[PDB]
Amino acid sequence: TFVDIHAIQTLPYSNINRDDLGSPKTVVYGGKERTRVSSQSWKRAVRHEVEARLGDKAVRTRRIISEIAKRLRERGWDADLADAGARQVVLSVGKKSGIKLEKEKDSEAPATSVLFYLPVPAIDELAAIADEHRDAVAKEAAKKTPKGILPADRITEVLKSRNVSVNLFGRMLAELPSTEVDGAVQFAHAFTVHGTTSAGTFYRYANVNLDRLVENTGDAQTARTAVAEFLRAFLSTVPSTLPDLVHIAVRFDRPISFAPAFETALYGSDGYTLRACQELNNYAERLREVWPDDAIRGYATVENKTDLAALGERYDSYPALIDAMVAAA
Amino acid sequence: TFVDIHAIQTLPYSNINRDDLGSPKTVVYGGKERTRVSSQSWKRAVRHEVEARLGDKAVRTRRIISEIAKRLRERGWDADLADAGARQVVLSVGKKSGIKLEKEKDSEAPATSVLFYLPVPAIDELAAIADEHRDAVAKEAAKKTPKGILPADRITEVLKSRNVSVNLFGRMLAELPSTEVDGAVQFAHAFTVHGTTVEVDFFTAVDDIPKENDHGSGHMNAGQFSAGTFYRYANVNLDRLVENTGDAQTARTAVAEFLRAFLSTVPSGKQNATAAMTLPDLVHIAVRFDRPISFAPAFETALYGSDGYTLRACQELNNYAERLREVWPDDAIRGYATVENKTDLAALGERYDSYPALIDAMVAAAF
Amino acid sequence: TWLTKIVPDLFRTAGNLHRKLIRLSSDLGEERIANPRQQLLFRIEETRNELYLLVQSHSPLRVDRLGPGYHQMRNLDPLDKGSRVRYRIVASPTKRLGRSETQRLTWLRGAAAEEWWHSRAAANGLELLSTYAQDDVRDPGTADRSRKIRHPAVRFDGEAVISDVDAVRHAVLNGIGRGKSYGCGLLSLALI
């Protein structure tokens, strides 16, 4: 019920994530500084490739009112009624008077204080809900302090709609705790195997909780496509090279990252790829002996210099490996 | 009669347990700051995995009245009678008039001032006790200030029921000191072997609807995480666990179940953003009869660094275990299990190939 | 060249920073070419208090009034191609264009600053430049001593494989970008 994927991937200097001052992000791990790529970055690259490949896109935006305003303006509303109607959309929902808005900016609709995260067709449906109540909106647009006239239940039902990215990574909305979705994916911070003081061979790890992804999408068939698509995105995408080794395990008790395997930094002077793959192999072997399990393992590698026996059955290609382990789960 | 378990476990840029401001909790120990995971957190993770694996779940809740209200409502009571009956449940017990309640919230039943900690089927039995006396509850529901009509002895007997988690970690009720159970487990605060400076990750959420002449990043913040090799320790007082469950066979399953949970579980705070799942690098179960001894002084002198702390931490815990067995002689049944094979670690007793084999051998050595 | 870690005390403005860097060096020289770069360089490292600063230099510095209580200083002479080494740097990406009523000033964003920079390095050392996209100064009243301006720096960082050593080192000694006398120019490298 847990699919975890490990990956060793050397990376070019340009693709690395930067801190606030421009330096690549670093972990002092194992006592030695190691450059890292933050998880939120590679996760963003994964969600954009998944949305682009699976076709449905979700939108994390602070400016929902302005976007609803373009849809109401294309529906035939006057610009002022479109702005007042979109304000009614965010004013009609939540415990307090309405969703809190940022200070008003000249000539533009105010941004909400919190980042909404909803699929695109759901935003259009919010426009339709604000559309059928056009006269009530026109009457409240004349008042000095208009109140939330639109039905709250209909809007909350639209804001609960889930994209594949919402099903996979979860969302959070503090004013509407009914819309919060538990994420089904744990994405670790990719750090280097060796100390770096940029370039290097990063270790990458990620989990997929099948019980929660099946619970989110509901049907197991869309969860199956979501998992296979996620794993392929995990291998293909770069935050803006192919991974040197990939190891998908399908474990039922609990996910286990092999990050302790690289806590002792590699010395150097020689290519870290072969030693990193061999070290991940020895740690996988030692963990399968120490923690016995029936987990369906499997790996795919570029190097043929070693058999790497502990990483399970070898597959010739990454898509063959993904298809075999997803079909195994 | 004392089973104590030691464990070295590295966590990579986890930040599993945060303070009130978001920074990971730290101990200034040995003169050097060392990030720590609070004991109550890992204890919560252990009790949820134990309840989930052993099947029986206990519920620590500040809103018992509302839950009894759903059971009485599913028994055929009207909503108002269900609310009045659950108020009678908490009103009928305790020294004073009743269990004190928090200020009333609109549309919802008031929460008790103190957190109740009782198994789920016991809450359902409280619903049955309030159910049998439905007419008396209906008569007191009409009065302005209804009194505790339900029998106090039956309710107190239901509130005394113990889950495995109650048997293991104990409970406290101030209004009903008869229900308090002494915990059988001492859970130490997991601190790092080495000194750790809190590492700040500056992050920004990017906005998806652009405006002209702006990439328009939506939000900015600095989230602080940390990594390191934690030392972990815990005790199990077999005499109290046997006293709580009563029978030695359920205590045996509870102990083995606890030790496995201690090894398997992790705090789970900020794990979607960082996958901190990891197995301990070394585990050392001792079955001592005189008194439990934590090896935390072994790591009071912080490790210097630049090299992997795992091998030095395991070797240092070995030297301190050797030194203590010489200084404090005992017949305690020892035993350990390790990932590294670079050292024999002779003082930690008989080596076992796997964690379940070690747990089964030391639990079988104590019961 | 030679490197020192130094720290001015009381710094109110940037020009007085410049002047505090030149008044501790008596014998100064200047070798110029019509269009090429002039042949110290310096980087501001901690500015809210006093102001710690790393200086690259040709002529030797000795502590002055209100200086350090000591003369750190090392003289260094430079780096194998293909090898990666740590970089670093502050510069001012610009675009000069006819101004209403000339003006220094994809293309702003973080991508033409990367274009601009890798243009700066050219065939020298290949590198990645931390993209910034956002300091004021005025004359202290001294005659013929500048006036008042604005500006915008950008810091850049990582390991930079060099493709021409003598020429990237040439770039290290000459400086990258305008306003070298106001904090910019200095590129710092270290082995990986």
Side-chain angles (χ1 to χ4, degrees), chain B residues 52-71:
Chain B
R53 189 174 169 86
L54 204 56
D56 52 342
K57 294 184 180 225
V59 167
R60 178 185 307 277
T61 184
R62 202 182 33 158
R63 27 185 115 101
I64 194 129
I65 297 173
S66 175
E67 196 56 13
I68 297 180
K70 23 174 65 178
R71 303 187 182 90

Side-chain angles (χ1 to χ4, degrees), chain B residues 52-256:
Chain B
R53 189 174 169 86
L54 204 56
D56 52 342
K57 294 184 180 225
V59 167
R60 178 185 307 277
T61 184
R62 202 182 33 158
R63 27 185 115 101
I64 194 129
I65 297 173
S66 175
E67 196 56 13
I68 297 180
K70 23 174 65 178
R71 303 187 182 90
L72 293 182
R73 190 172 298 103
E74 62 93 355
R75 292 180 178 267
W77 287 59
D78 181 70
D80 294 337
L81 283 182
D83 188 354
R87 290 178 177 268
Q88 295 298 326
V89 179
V90 301
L91 207 53
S92 59
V93 351
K95 40 184 71 181
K96 290 170 167 186
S97 75
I99 296 294
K100 293 183 284 180
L101 304 176
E102 204 71 5
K103 285 298 188 63
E104 179 66 9
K105 302 288 179 180
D106 49 15
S107 187
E108 52 189 11
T112 64
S113 292
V114 70
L115 292 300
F116 283 92
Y117 189 50
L118 40 103
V120 181
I123 200 176
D124 185 23
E125 296 212 3
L126 291 176
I129 299 178
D131 187 25
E132 158 169 325
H133 303 283
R134 181 172 185 172
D135 41 9
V137 170
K139 292 180 180 300
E140 296 289 325
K143 296 183 177 179
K144 297 179 180 175
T145 60
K147 299 181 178 55
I149 303 300
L150 293 334
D153 222 340
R154 295 182 64 189
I155 298 183
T156 309
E157 292 300 326
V158 168
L159 301 178
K160 287 180 182 180
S161 65
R162 297 179 180 90
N163 189 334
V164 174
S165 298
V166 178
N167 295 322
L168 208 50
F169 300 109
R171 82 170 72 186
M172 168 177 170
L173 241 270
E175 293 83 352
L176 292 170
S178 56
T179 65
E180 293 181 353
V181 179
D182 354 335
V185 158
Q186 302 177 341
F187 217 95
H189 288 267
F191 60 93
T192 53
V193 172
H194 61 279
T196 62
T197 184
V198 64
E199 174 78 44
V200 190
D201 170 77
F202 173 86
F203 80 73
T204 57
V206 57
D207 203 336
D208 282 336
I209 284 318
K211 70 179 174 67
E212 198 184 357
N213 311 343
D214 187 24
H215 316 62
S217 87
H219 181 63
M220 303 172 64
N221 275 151
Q224 42 279 57
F225 311 157
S226 160
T229 71
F230 294 161
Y231 169 75
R232 306 173 43 197
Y233 172 76
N235 289 331
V236 177
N237 194 338
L238 292 181
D239 294 339
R240 286 179 182 170
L241 184 57
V242 169
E243 173 177 358
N244 288 335
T245 59
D247 67 321
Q249 190 64 40
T250 62
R252 189 177 189 273
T253 63
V255 172

Side-chain angles (χ1 to χ4, degrees), chain C residues 6 8-31 33-45 47-49 52-55 57-61 63-78 80-86 88 90-93 95-96 98-107 109-116 118-126 131-148 150-154 157-158 160-161 163 165-172:
Chain C
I6 70 167
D9 307 328
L10 296 94
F11 183 65
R12 180 57 69 190
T13 184
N16 200 339
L17 193 168
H18 186 294
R19 175 183 70 87
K20 301 292 104 172
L21 184 68
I22 64 180
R23 66 179 175 84
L24 204 270
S25 54
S26 180
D27 297 333
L28 293 177
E30 293 85 6
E31 183 179 358
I33 307 180
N35 297 328
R37 316 172 148 276
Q38 276 199 10
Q39 177 183 8
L40 280 57
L41 290 169
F42 69 88
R43 184 174 69 246
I44 287 169
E45 191 268 329
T47 177
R48 53 154 184 299
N49 302 119
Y52 292 171
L53 201 163
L54 181 68
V55 186
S57 42
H58 295 285
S59 267
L61 183 172
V63 56
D64 61 344
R65 61 180 178 278
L66 179 79
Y70 294 94
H71 56 78
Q72 193 51 58
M73 302 205 162
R74 188 64 179 82
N75 189 350
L76 181 146
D77 281 321
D80 192 350
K81 313 301 99 189
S83 63
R84 270 316 197 320
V85 305
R86 278 276 269 247
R88 160 87 110 307
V90 71
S92 184
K95 119 114 189 160
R96 53 150 185 312
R99 171 170 303 166
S100 183
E101 70 197 4
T102 187
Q103 62 171 357
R104 252 131 208 225
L105 169 142
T106 331
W107 235 333
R109 302 79 181 91
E114 185 284 328
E115 187 287 328
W116 181 88
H118 65 62
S119 311
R120 285 295 193 285
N124 307 335
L126 166 77
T131 45
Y132 206 71
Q134 299 313 298
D135 182 11
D136 189 332
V137 67
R138 66 182 176 274
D139 61 347
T142 300
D144 187 69
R145 196 169 273 287
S146 159
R147 260 96 39 92
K148 63 175 187 64
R150 284 62 94 139
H151 196 151
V154 196
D157 190 349
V161 146
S163 181
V165 36
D166 57 26
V168 61
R169 171 187 300 107
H170 184 201
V172 170

